[PDB]
Structure formats: structure tokens, C-alpha cells
DNA sequence: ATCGCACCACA
DNA sequence: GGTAGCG
């Protein structure tokens with residue numbers, strides 16, 4: 001309700017300022033106008049944010065289908081620097097943004113940090129929710145450079161999803177509370193930043209309303225490194241004669257792309 | 272013309 | 283509260 005109030009008050013602030021093939025492809029200046037269009041649309045359409053030429057993090061918002069988006073995106077000629085918008089209150093996969101500064105952390109073995117993180121999360125999902133999974137259900141995406149160990153993990157739980165990304169965040173700050181206290185041996189998550197201050201390997205700042213999350217094969221606009229399937233990745237989509245593996249990987253990586261299932265379990269976690 | 276949320280603060 | 287620095 002509070003969220004409903006501030007969101008509409010921002011829109012009040014903004015008010016103060018020969019058949020062709022079926023294709024939906026609309027751009028908007030305000031992310032709220034994009035969602036207005038989505039609700040009005042009646043086709044399974046989703047919101048993307050495109051970083052426009054700048055150093056700025058300014059975005060325009062694109063509205064289309066996953067299938068049509070991929071069609072114009074997959075060559076990586078255009079639509080560089082693209083972001084998934086994780087809609088508030090939509091069911092979503094459990095995901096992670098993991099990063100640490102490599103010079104500031106000469107001892108850290110990032111590969112083992114993800115493997116031990118995944119194991120603890122899988123134990124947490126079993127103990128708290130009865131969900132059984134393993135690293136074979138984790139899509140491992142890498143955007144690392146020589147300065148930064150950067151990885152995105154997207155869990156592919158069978159017939160399971162979280163109520164929305166706020167609840168993913170509540171679930172994570174609950175199970176990571178021992179780690180947040182070093183600020184059952186979760187010390188392997190603590191890392192130094194540039195200024196020597198210890199933080200977590202797990203970035204807790206991405207579980208926010210309408211969080212932008214950088215697409216598979218997109219780079220930040222300043223940069224050249226794009227998210228790509230990590231070498232050690234152990235999640236493999238079932239192969240299909242009807243879709244390319246790369247499209248399979250794309251759809252798995254979309255946090256809001258919850259597999260339509262008739263037996264779906266929805267996980268909640270309250271603060 | 273993006274968006275939506277730790278560290279200080281006063282009292 | 284009260285914001286600006288962050289993601």
C-alpha cells in the first residue's frame with residue numbers, strides 16, 4: 001500500500017513535468033508507462049531496460065515478448081546493454097549477484113566460494129522449505145574482469161519459485177544472518193572492498209522493487225564484458241529440436257521467467 | 272527523460 | 283527522519 005502510494009505520487013510528479021506480422025515492440029521514457037502498457041496488453045509481454053548512450057545509468061524501457069526480443073537481440077549487433085526488469089510482486093526465481101574485488105582479496109578462491117555458497121543455500125532450501133536441489137540446478141553466469149570477480153547465479157527449481165524478489169531477499173538475509181554478524185562458519189563469504197571494509201560476497205542490494213538485472217550476453221554501457229555461461233556451469237537445459245540451446249539459456253537466465261507448471265510451489269519469507 | 276532503495280541525525 | 287550514495 002505504501003508502495004502503491006509513492007509509485008502513483010511519482011506518476012503525479014511526472015504529470016507535473018496488407019497485414020504486417022504480429023509484433024509488439026514499444027519503447028517508453030518512464031518505466032511506469034511501460035508497466036501500464038503491459039497490464040493493458042493481453043499478450044505475454046515483459047519489460048526490458050536499455051541503457052542509452054551515456055556514462056549515466058539512464059534507461060529507456062522496452063516492451064515485447066521473450067521470443068521477439070531474442071530475435072533482434074541474439075546476433076549481439078544491437079540491443080547491447082540490456083536489463084531484465086524484475087516486476088514488483090511477480091513470482092521469480094531465486095537469484096544471486098556475487099562480486100568481490102580481486103586485488104583487495106588475493107587469497108579468495110571465487111570458484112570455491114560459489115560452490116560453498118550454493119551448498120549452504122541448498123541446505124537452507126531443504127531445511128526451511130523441503131526443496132531439494134543442487135549445483136546442477138544453478139545457472140552460473142560470469143562477468144569477471146581482472147579487477148572484479150563477478151557472477152550471476154539463477155536457480156532453476158523444479159515446480160518452485162519465490163513469491164517475489166523481496167521475499168528472495170528476506171530469505172537470504174535470514175539464512176545469511178551469521179555472515180552479517182561477522183561484519184555456522186559462513187566466514188568464507190566475507191571479503192574486503194577497495195577501502196578495506198569487510199562486506200559480503202553476496203550482494204544484498206539487488207532484491208528491490210523493479211530491480212534491473214543485466215541480461216545474459218549484455219555488458220554495462222561503459223564496458224565490454226558481457227555475462228556468459230561460466231566454464232564450471234552445471235545447469236544444462238533439456239535440448240529441444242524446436243529452440244536453440246542459446247535461447248534455452250536465455251530463458252533460464254530470466255529471473256521473472258518462472259516455468260508455467262500445474263503443481264507450482266510458491267515460497268514466501270517475511271522480515 | 273532511470274529507478275528505488277547504510278550511515279547520520281536530532282530529539 | 284532524511285538523504286545521497288549505491289546497486
Ligand SMILES: Nc1ncnc2c1ncn2[C@H]1C[C@H](O)[C@@H](COP(=O)(O)OP(=O)(O)OP(=O)(O)O)O1
Pocket residue numbers: 057083097099143144150151206211212213214220273274289
Ligand atoms: N544505476 C542503475 N540504475 C538502475 N539499475 C541499476 C543501476 N546500477 C545497477 N543496477 C542494477 C542492474 C545490475 O545488473 C544490478 C546489479 O548491479 P551491479 O553489480 O552494479 O551490475 P552487474 O552485476 O550487472 O555487473 P558487475 O559485473 O559490474 O557486477 O543492479
Ligand SMILES: [Ca+2]
Pocket residue numbers: 097098099150151203
Ligand atoms: Ca554485480
